[model samples]
Target chain A: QDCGLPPDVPNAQPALEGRTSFPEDTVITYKCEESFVKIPGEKDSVICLKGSQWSDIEEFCNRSCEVPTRLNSASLKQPYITQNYFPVGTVVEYECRPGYRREPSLSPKLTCLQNLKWSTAVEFCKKKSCPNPGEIRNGQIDVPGGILFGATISFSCNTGYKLFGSTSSFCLISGSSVQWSDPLPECREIYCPAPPQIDNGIIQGERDHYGYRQSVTYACNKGFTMIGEHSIYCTVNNDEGEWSGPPPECRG
Target chain B: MQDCGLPPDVPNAQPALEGRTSFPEDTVITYKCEESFVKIPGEKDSVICLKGSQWSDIEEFCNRSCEVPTRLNSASLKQPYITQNYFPVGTVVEYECRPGYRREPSLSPKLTCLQNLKWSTAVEFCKKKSCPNPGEIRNGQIDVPGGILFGATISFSCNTGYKLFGSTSSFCLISGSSVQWSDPLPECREIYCPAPPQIDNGIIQGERDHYGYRQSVTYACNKGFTMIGEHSIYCTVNNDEGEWSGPPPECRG
Candidate 1:
């Protein structure tokens, strides 16, 4: 029996169709999804295999959308989204959480291409609001609107009193405190009428220029005697009246 | 009997010659010969009259030749020949003068009439007026250079402190019948300003500044005391008046 010719011989002319495909050097490219960016050197190129089939190398395309790292808590909901596997000419839409507005709505949609690049980068939304100025005492804010951040206020002493330090201060955002334009303000001790000079009298009062209350007493030396007010006292006053009693005159 | 015989005899008929001579209106026909010859009309025309067996009119042609009028070049001459009848075909007149000498006033030196019937005027020579070279001067004095006319100049100087304002020399030209000075005469005057007194603890320093014909001086107070008023004051020149400078320095605590 001529058993149907040997099995190997029957298939002797190997099929050339599958092997006829282009060589391994053949390349193909994949584009990044919409609103997403491609990682450099990845997913953009693929080579043909020696077996006439495509090779599977892991390359991934990523989103180009920028995430907001500095957004306030009130505006955090509704995280941004990017399209996956978006082909060229594809568009992605963006939205913000309630109460927050996109700085500019409708940032241009990104596209994917054979080059593996996106047409545009992603955009984020920002919240808008105004803050009020904190409390300030004894000084006037030169700025009209209540001292919002960055506003300045100036201070002046009442009549008869002189300012001890800076006349102005500014509100700062970082410090939550106001910066004085000049040194601090302090009340200066009023110079009492030069102690009345007397022939035989001695005077007594607090050491330097400061004191809650000051008093000067005049008395004639041991053998000498005194005339006019023998004792005088200084007292602090809130109103316009003199802080110190009328000057005491002394004479022998 | 003679009257009876002549009555029938008609006067001899005159011969008729047919020919036409056309002439423009207002044209005069005259006849002339050598010096001693003249015609019946003399210089006036008389209508023709008929006489027995004779013609009363005669046609005459005059012998005439043109002589150019003498022209002087003292003034420019334009189109020397204006008389149309005096010029004819085949007739030409040439103009010439002594060599080395040009026509006195005419611009065209030579003129010719072409066969096509155009005429030109003869050119003349021009005598240029002579002028002297401009003169130069050293310092303030000037002597004009020798020539038909010369220029002179005067120099000027500013007074002790005053500055001179104009040019130092001027010129005289033959054409310009007047004398010119470079600039107007300047007057000398003293530059005046109270010299700033030196302060015991400080010194005064500044440069002179001129503004609107006046000088201005600025002052500063000593280190300890602050200056309060205007830093600078100006001294203006009052026309024909004396020199004026800044105000007195004021020292205050």
Candidate 2:
């Protein structure tokens, strides 16, 4: 038999390369830039075709950090971040308005990739530091820690007067914030004295009890006369002690 | 010596005896009769004066029993009686009503003391024993024995499908002066259908039907089909009977 093929063709026939094949259930994943979450159930997986090429390019669904709802009496600059992707070593700085104090630090700078979340929730500055001093006319402070966040301070008025405000307030951790137990401590009006109505005389004193002792003075107009003890002061003897002496009666 | 002779001659006068003077305090003794023993005071202690030597008149005392106030039987007395009185101890007074009579319980047993003392708490009875009549049977029979006591019970019910309202049973009770049933008499009402259905298509112009407590209305499918099911069926008061205007008329396709 005569061989018709060329010697080189018979010796070097080109070999067909096998194409890459993917399993029926094969899946692939893709990630978006930082500060973004993938939209659920949207194009997260992709397959390969018989031609050794991907059937479809895997796509990533992502969104930038959403701005939190703005609060009244406060303002935020660029409340939300625009870029969806952030590489390692990204940093963000938070600032507050003048006269307001930043809780985390003077100018807190949070590293993005290092710390998953903001160093601290952003807080609008506050004008006042520590709460206004509570007024306790007749009573004394049960526990004494200047009102700050999470501090429970109670008020008790003098024997005659009763405490009007909440007996106890709690420091609260609100959304990205700290607040006093209650708005402010208010001293209530004291009850009028009973018995022996004196003419031309009235009780004269400040509303709340302060310091370790509280005092109330009785006065009968400038010209009128005063009888009995003119002024009575109550002092705390121990941690818990009853008002000293019988409630002084002002007589004319 | 001459004086002595004259005196001796003047009198062989007997030596006079002296009388004693001091007497005890509260010495006058008097006596009176005991309670229920009505008595009058008399001269209690009158003594003869030794010097005068005359007899004193005797003191007199009298005893009697006062008439007692009317003693109401069974009525509580203002005050309890003390013993030693005219009324005897345990003097029970029996009370009874005329024949064919009855009275509330604890009203007839009264006792009294004859010594003007009244009986304890009024105890009286009536001549007639009146009780509520047997419950009226509207739908069902009354299940009670004859001669029920003051607090006897009687149950009642209505026939099937008929709605029974009011008390099912009543007990006899005495309120105020008359005997009455513990609960008001029960009544049996036939379960009737609610108002007739108001159709949007046409008006049902007919008086309410009275199948016991039910009414029926017939509808014509507005010139369509003749009618279906029971053309004039109604929701009768009879609970056993089915309700529905006979399978709603089948509309022509």
Candidate 3:
């Protein structure tokens, strides 16, 4: 007796390529579809039994890796082409993103395994840190976070002083090393010229030049009335010191 | 060149012709996979002796068999442990919960051998067994760090002046396939001393029918007599037995 066409298997095709009739004792082989792999120990061929029945066929073809996914970076090495599926034993490489450190002991390659799953993935890159920039003289540095990669440092002068360089700098990658983008700024002392001269008024607390925020008072000559403010103080604007208000004038 | 010897020994395959050791140049030999090994599709099933007296390279013609399944974390094989390796395709095995564990109602306990010579992923189907409460003790308090579950420990203590009897602590432990507390529950008993003894020259000021632990009694010599030793005595523990702190005071004339 002859058996009808052998039963169909998922992801596999009959090796004989479409002849329906199989006489008793006829053996037929099956091939896994593209991107699918055969699982060993499984008999891929079935024999037509004496009763005109085809032997049962076990699942031997399994679909493999979808895509390699990971943390630290989504960029993979060049020469890798995208496909719907990857077969077992396929290997691909990847690299960490900027500011992330690559560990010498870890592997950056991912491989499709016989289990139809990718090999265990490890985060091969760790966070990078820059040298402490240390403290600045006559000024304070605001480090929002540690001196780790991507962190920013803000520089500001204390009262009576002005900043002399870049106000802020960032920690970034530099030729395979993490470093500060700019050097620490300086804090220079600020001063204002002696209180502006006033007609018929004598300036008090006057010096060749007074430091920032220093104040002075004006006294009108006897019998002369004073107009405007009697005091002026040195204040900063755009890193330069200026008087707080116009000088007082005496009127007869 | 010498004749090729013993056509290439391909895994899971042998020459269809028997007893032929020597293969001369241009000689062809067909191969068939061993029993239970299916011929791999698209692979060469035969090799030819080349002009240089060497057999041509032949791809593997048969797939391999699966080994015994890997161990499950909280489950064991339902059938007796299998010593045989190399299970053929389509083989299926079952698992059961280990001692002190129970089956999870939602998960399956079966694994199938695949054509890749590996078993399918095994899901944890057993959960740790929960033990029953040992109940509370009268006149005592129970301190359970964790609930009544495997590996949890429970401690027992009695209120002030009450003595605890039996184990002060017990642990939830596994016994074969079930779980139980390691020791029996303890009990608390009230502590009291017998009635105070009569003194030769004094009488107890606060005599009572019953005297409990930490209870004290004052003694006085009838007016003209002087008292010796402590003026009062209290009930306390001695070697787990209740007794008065000291002998009753004597009155000296």
Candidate 4:
């Protein structure tokens, strides 16, 4: 005969006073017990449609928590972007990058349960290791304890050799595999084209061609003084080797 | 990226796939259908894995079927029962003669579901016994109201002056593939009537001892006598019997 029994939430009391029977269509909201939160996809209260029967409470204010906010080295699948701020019982799946795979302990698929934490760690994708880049003739290369994704190696030629192609290369991850960014550098014997002739002057290293770092000294004839650099050093560039430093000449 | 497992299986197909159970994303797998099977038009032969674990959808499938069977009027058919979800091929169904009909060995009225997903043609089968051309009748005629094929019946009739001397009806039979009475042919015989009546002082015309079909006689009174009825009468036939056209006449003295 009266709008009664504040909302039916556990330990719930009505804002209004002294009511026993709730009227039809009476609505009431609820507040959870300590350390508890509301379940998602559900409302806060019960409704009294015809007044005889109350509403359903499959899940009242739940005492649950969210999953990890985000996972490392992986992206969430589908409706779930793989993050916290989701309701208990929500599910998410992770896809790992190349050279990485889901950890053995947990399935790539995970469910967000009552526990505040995720079933697996944010860092579940494990990286794979590959062997080191090997040796080359007349050259030395960077050596690392372990060759992993993003690891790099640099190469340089001996004093007389030339380093060919890329001087530096790094390991990169491909889908579920790992490979080098470029082929390893090669070292070849450096050669310099014939040295330039100075008018009225003779050259010291008078060979047809010169090896890398080799130098040819110049001198002027009697009564002529030497000008420009006294010697030219053979150097390598673009595989077709050339010489460095200016050529020397003599003039009266 | 992880492998997505083996490629999907096709009906009427040989598995030609080679790959890891889990393929890295972007890895490709290729496949083809078996003999007698055709691929969907404009469909590619390979699929690539994209989202790391799964492969692209299969746009085509192997398809082929036996030809659908012919429907015979006398035969009742049962369609082949292949799974509704996929009739990859090889569906078979057969036919049975309806009541009063029978099965012949030829078309056997059988329909087989083949790998092509079609019902095989029913070459021959299912038949009812039929009467052959009923032998011709002389002076009389016979008729088949229905077809001359199995289960057909014939009726016999006579001309104005003749009579059907045998059974009025005959039928084709299944037993030993024979016909009743050997033929639709019904026997025929000539019809006859009694001699003309005579009276004192009256003259009866026509010289025959007995009358047969279409025969007529005339009666008249002598110079001092008189005829009571019409002067002429003739003999006629119906079905198997013969009768006079009118009442007999007498002469008055």
| TM-score per model over all chains | 0.21, 0.24, 0.34, 0.31
> TM-score of model 1, chain A?
0.31
Model 4 docking grade = incorrect
Cα lDDT of model 4 by residue, B1-253, tens digit: 4556666664556545553566666777776766655565456767777775776876556666443354566777664432232234555465777544656774556566665455655554766655456767786655443445566666676655676776898766554534334343666777787666665676775558778865666655565443455445666554346776666455555
lDDT of 2: 0.43
For model 3, residues B9-59, the per-residue Cα lDDT tens digits are 888898865587787778889898886575665678999888778888898
Docking quality category of candidate 3 according to DockQ thresholds: incorrect
Local distance difference test values of all predictions, in order: 0.38, 0.43, 0.74, 0.61
Residue B133 of model 3: what lDDT? 75
lDDT of 2 by residue, B112-212 (tens): 54444444545454433456567455654454532355555566655544666788777766666645767766666666565566444434546465444
Chain A TM-score of each candidate structure, as shown: 0.31, 0.36, 0.53, 0.51
Best by lDDT: 3
Task: Considering only chain B, report the TM-score of each candidate against the true chain B.
Answer: 0.26, 0.41, 0.57, 0.46
* C-alpha DockQ of every model: 0.00, 0.00, 0.00, 0.00
- Candidate 2 regions with alpha-carbon error over 4 angstroms: A1-252, B1-128, B134-143, B159-162, B195-216, B224-228, B236-242
Q: Output the lDDT of residue B158, model 4.
A: 61
- In candidate 3 the C-alpha lDDT for residue A238 amounts to 56
Candidate 3: give the TM-score of chain A: 0.53
